[PDB]
Scaffold this motif. Sequence first.
Motif, PDB file in Angstrom:
ATOM      1  N   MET A  34       1.157  -1.162  -0.045  1.00 30.57           N
ATOM      2  CA  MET A  34       0.049   0.385  -0.331  1.00 30.57           C
ATOM      3  C   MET A  34       1.009   1.457  -0.139  1.00 30.57           C
ATOM      4  O   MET A  34       1.821   1.451   0.496  1.00 30.57           O
ATOM      5  N   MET A  35      -0.283   2.316  -0.553  1.00 27.03           N
ATOM      6  CA  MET A  35       1.256   3.621  -0.520  1.00 27.03           C
ATOM      7  C   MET A  35       0.481   4.288   1.192  1.00 27.03           C
ATOM      8  O   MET A  35      -0.451   5.139   0.801  1.00 27.03           O
ATOM      9  N   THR A  36       1.408   5.017   1.194  1.00 24.04           N
ATOM     10  CA  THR A  36       1.555   6.146   2.302  1.00 24.04           C
ATOM     11  C   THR A  36       1.814   7.003   2.102  1.00 24.04           C
ATOM     12  O   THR A  36       1.471   7.710   1.072  1.00 24.04           O
ATOM     13  N   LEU A  57      -3.356   2.877   4.372  1.00 17.17           N
ATOM     14  CA  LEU A  57      -5.130   2.283   3.591  1.00 17.17           C
ATOM     15  C   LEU A  57      -5.389   0.675   4.778  1.00 17.17           C
ATOM     16  O   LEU A  57      -5.693  -0.065   4.008  1.00 17.17           O
ATOM     17  N   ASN A  58      -3.862   0.573   5.771  1.00  8.99           N
ATOM     18  CA  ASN A  58      -3.632  -0.498   6.654  1.00  8.99           C
ATOM     19  C   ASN A  58      -5.147  -0.626   6.618  1.00  8.99           C
ATOM     20  O   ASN A  58      -5.262  -1.840   6.996  1.00  8.99           O
ATOM     21  N   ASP A  59      -5.712   0.642   7.244  1.00  8.89           N
ATOM     22  CA  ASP A  59      -7.147   0.660   8.104  1.00  8.89           C
ATOM     23  C   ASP A  59      -7.914  -0.890   7.335  1.00  8.89           C
ATOM     24  O   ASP A  59      -9.105  -1.980   7.819  1.00  8.89           O
ATOM     25  N   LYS A  60      -7.613  -1.171   5.925  1.00  4.38           N
ATOM     26  CA  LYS A  60      -8.249  -1.995   4.965  1.00  4.38           C
ATOM     27  C   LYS A  60      -8.676  -3.568   5.983  1.00  4.38           C
ATOM     28  O   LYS A  60      -9.172  -4.054   6.356  1.00  4.38           O
ATOM     29  N   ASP A  61      -6.673  -3.718   6.628  1.00  3.30           N
ATOM     30  CA  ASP A  61      -7.287  -5.162   7.294  1.00  3.30           C
ATOM     31  C   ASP A  61      -6.462  -4.534   9.195  1.00  3.30           C
ATOM     32  O   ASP A  61      -5.905  -4.148   9.434  1.00  3.30           O
ATOM     33  N   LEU A 103      -8.776   3.072  10.260  1.00  4.92           N
ATOM     34  CA  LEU A 103      -9.214   3.079  11.437  1.00  4.92           C
ATOM     35  C   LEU A 103      -9.496   3.373  12.241  1.00  4.92           C
ATOM     36  O   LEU A 103      -9.774   2.998  13.226  1.00  4.92           O
ATOM     37  N   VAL A 104      -9.249   4.872  11.831  1.00 10.24           N
ATOM     38  CA  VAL A 104      -9.293   5.876  13.252  1.00 10.24           C
ATOM     39  C   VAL A 104     -10.053   6.512  12.664  1.00 10.24           C
ATOM     40  O   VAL A 104     -10.548   7.949  13.272  1.00 10.24           O
ATOM     41  N   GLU A 105     -10.524   7.324  11.484  1.00  8.77           N
ATOM     42  CA  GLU A 105     -11.255   7.600  10.890  1.00  8.77           C
ATOM     43  C   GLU A 105     -12.557   7.097   9.461  1.00  8.77           C
ATOM     44  O   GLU A 105     -13.504   7.748   9.040  1.00  8.77           O
ATOM     45  N   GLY A 106     -12.081   6.412   8.851  1.00 11.41           N
ATOM     46  CA  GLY A 106     -12.287   5.677   8.279  1.00 11.41           C
ATOM     47  C   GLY A 106     -12.564   5.873   6.225  1.00 11.41           C
ATOM     48  O   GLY A 106     -13.338   5.411   5.903  1.00 11.41           O
ATOM     49  N   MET A 107     -11.590   7.409   6.503  1.00 11.06           N
ATOM     50  CA  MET A 107     -11.638   8.073   5.383  1.00 11.06           C
ATOM     51  C   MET A 107     -10.124   8.563   5.043  1.00 11.06           C
ATOM     52  O   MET A 107     -10.052   9.395   4.379  1.00 11.06           O
ATOM     53  N   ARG A 108      -9.861   7.679   5.531  1.00 13.74           N
ATOM     54  CA  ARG A 108      -8.205   7.604   5.133  1.00 13.74           C
ATOM     55  C   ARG A 108      -7.824   7.131   4.541  1.00 13.74           C
ATOM     56  O   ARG A 108      -6.267   6.829   3.889  1.00 13.74           O
TER      57      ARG A 108
END
Length: 108
Positions: A34-36, A57-61, A103-108
């Motif tokens: 993923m790209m930060t 985009l780690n939120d994905k997992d 994972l702390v916003e869902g829009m990051r």
Amino acid sequence: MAKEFGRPQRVAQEMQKEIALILQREIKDPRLGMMTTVSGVEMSRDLAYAKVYVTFLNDKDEDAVKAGIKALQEASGFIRSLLGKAMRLRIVPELTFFYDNSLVEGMR
């Protein structure tokens, strides 16, 4: 990263681009498939403290977000030290690493 002036913005840029690079290069970007991004940067040399922002985009997992971030956490002093050395400076300010994923916003 695109402010060639004599103000504190210029240096902030060159540094933002330099840190953004080492933050996207020295970091585990390819290891996280993923790209930060760097939607935040703070450098306070008035004393010795800075605050950098990094969104993934780690939120994905939640597994890759927890573990991943954990890796970015352990490599904290590594990125900070790697930077100071990478930029052979002195200010070596407390440039913290803020991870703002989805994972702390869902829009990051």
